[PDB]
Write a protein that binds this ligand. Structure first.
Ligand code: CA
Length: 380
C-alpha cells in the first residue's frame, strides 16, 4: 500500500514519493553520495528515501524550506525518521536547520555554516545521543552561544541497533520548554544556559597558608624500629642451586642471522640500526644459558614504608575558592524561543556505516498537521 499526503500548510515536508532526491543540494565546500531507493529488504513497495551510502563523509545535502520559518506566533515542529540499516559504530544522522541569511549559498554548505537548531540521533562507540541544540545570540558580545539540552530519561541504544526505522519528533513551544517524542514516546523534555550570573576574580589566589587537606598523618604515631623500611620485597633463595647442564658461557640471546639494516635505513637518524636478538639455539637443549640468577623468594622482613595513621586536619580551612566578583558580560534570558530564523534543513554528517535511511522530512508549526503526516508516513 501507500498514501501519505500533506494536511495543513507546509513549511517543509518531503516524502521522496516522487522517487528522486529532486530538490537537494550536495555541498562543494572542502564526498560520500546519496540515493533514494526502497528500504533494504523493504516491507513497503513504494517508500524509498534519501539514503547515505559511504564511509567517506556525507558532508553535504540540504534543501531550502518553502518559507523562512520565523520564531514568533507559532511553535516549531520538525520530525524525520532514520534507520541505520547496518547499525552505527560511530556516526551521526541528525538534522541541521540552516539559519536564514540574504544569499544562502547552499552548495557552499560549509561546516561552520550558521544554523539555528541542531537535532537528532548521534552515537559514537557506545554513547547513543539524541541531540537538540539552539544557538543563542549573545545579546551583548553578540557571540553565538550554542545552548544544549540535557540527555533524556530512557536508554536509546535499541533505536540504533534494531535495524528498524525509528521516528524522531521535535517540538519547541514558545514556552521555552520542550520534549523529544521519538516513536511517539516523549523520551525527553524541558524548559549551558542563555542568561548567566556572576564570575570569580581570576586575580584572587589560593594563599599558600590555606590548607585544603582533610586528613593528615597523626604527627604522634611514629615509624617503629622493627619496621626496617630498607628491607626489599625479595631476597634470594639460598636454598636453591644452579642446575648442572647450565651453560655459563652460552650467551642468553644471539644476534639474528638476518641482520641486515635495510638499504632504506638512515643511521643519520632513522635511528641507529641494531640487529634484533634471536635466541641462542644451543640453549634449546639446555638447562639454562649465560649468567645465572639465583631465584628470589619473598622476603620475610619486608615491610613497605611508614604508614602513619590519618587524622582530621584541625586547620583544613575547606577547599578554597575565588571570591565571586560581579558579571560584566551579564546578559539576560529573554523569551529564548525568539531565535534567528532558518531557511533550510541540511545534513553534515560524519558517520561510519552506510545504508542510513532518512525519510519523511516534515516541518510544521501545528501539532495535528504534524501528528497526521506521522501516522500517515511512519504509522504505515
Ligand atoms: Ca518516504
Amino acid at each position: 500500500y501507500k498514501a501519505p499526503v500533506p494536511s495543513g500548510e507546509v513549511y517543509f515536508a518531503d516524502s521522496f514519493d516522487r522517487g528522486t532526491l529532486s530538490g537537494w543540494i550536495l555541498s562543494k565546500a572542502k564526498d560520500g553520495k546519496w540515493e533514494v531507493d526502497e528500504m533494504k529488504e523493504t516491507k513497503l513497495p513504494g517508500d524509498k528515501g534519501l539514503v547515505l551510502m559511504s564511509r567517506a563523509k556525507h558532508h553535504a545535502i540540504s534543501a531550502k524550506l518553502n518559507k523562512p520559518f520565523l520564531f514568533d506566533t507559532k511553535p516549531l515542529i520538525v520530525q524525520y525518521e532514520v534507520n541505520f540499516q547496518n547499525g552505527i559504530e560511530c556516526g551521526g544522522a541528525y538534522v541541521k536547520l540552516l539559519s536564514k541569511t540574504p544569499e544562502l549559498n547552499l552548495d557552499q554548505f560549509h561546516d561552520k555554516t550558521p544554523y539555528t537548531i541542531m537535532f537528532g540521533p548521534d552515537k559514537c562507540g557506545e554513547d547513543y545521543k539524541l541531540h537538540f541544540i539552539f544557538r543563542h545570540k549573545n545579546p551583548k558580545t553578540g557571540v553565538y552561544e550554542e545552548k544544549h539540552a540535557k540527555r533524556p530519561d530512557a536508554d536509546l541504544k535499541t533505536y540504533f541497533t534494531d535495524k528498524k526505522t525509528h521516528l524522531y519528533t521535535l517540538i519547541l513551544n514558545p514556552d521555552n520548554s520542550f520534549e523529544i517524542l521519538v516513536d511517539q514516546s516523549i523520551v525527553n523534555s524541558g524548559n549551558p544556559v542563555n542568561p548567566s550570573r556572576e564570575i570569580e576574580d581570576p586575580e584572587d589566589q589560593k594563599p599558600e597558608d590555606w590548607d585544603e587537606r582533610p586528613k593528615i598523618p597523626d604527627p604522634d604515631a611514629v615509624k617503629p624500629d622493627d619496621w626496617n623500611e630498607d628491607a626489599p620485597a625479595k631476597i634470594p633463595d639460598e636454598e636453591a642451586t644452579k642446575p648442572d647442564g647450565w651453560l655459563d658461557d652460552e650467551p642468553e640471546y644471539v644476534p639474528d642471522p638476518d641482520a641486515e639494516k635495510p638499504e632504506d635505513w638512515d643511521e643519520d637518524m632513522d635511528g641507529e640500526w641494531e640487529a634484533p636478538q634471536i635466541a641462542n639455539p644451543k640453549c634449546e637443549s639446555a638447562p639454562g644459558c649465560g649468567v645465572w640468577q639465583r631465584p628470589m623468594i619473598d622476603n620475610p622482613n619486608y615491610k613497605g614504608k611508614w604508614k602513619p595513621p590519618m587524622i582530621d586536619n584541625p586547620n583544613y580551612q575547606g577547599i578554597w575558592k575565588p571570591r565571586k566578583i560581579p558579571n560584566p558580560d551579564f546578559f539576560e534570558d529573554l523569551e529564548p524561543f525568539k531565535m534567528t530564523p532558518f531557511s533550510a534543513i541540511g545534513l553534515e554528517l560524519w558517520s561510519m556505516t552506510s545504508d542510513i535511511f532518512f525519510d519523511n522530512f516534515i516541518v510544521c508549526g501545528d501539532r495535528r498537521v504534524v501528528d497526521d503526516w506521522a501516522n500517515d508516513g511512519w504509522g504505515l
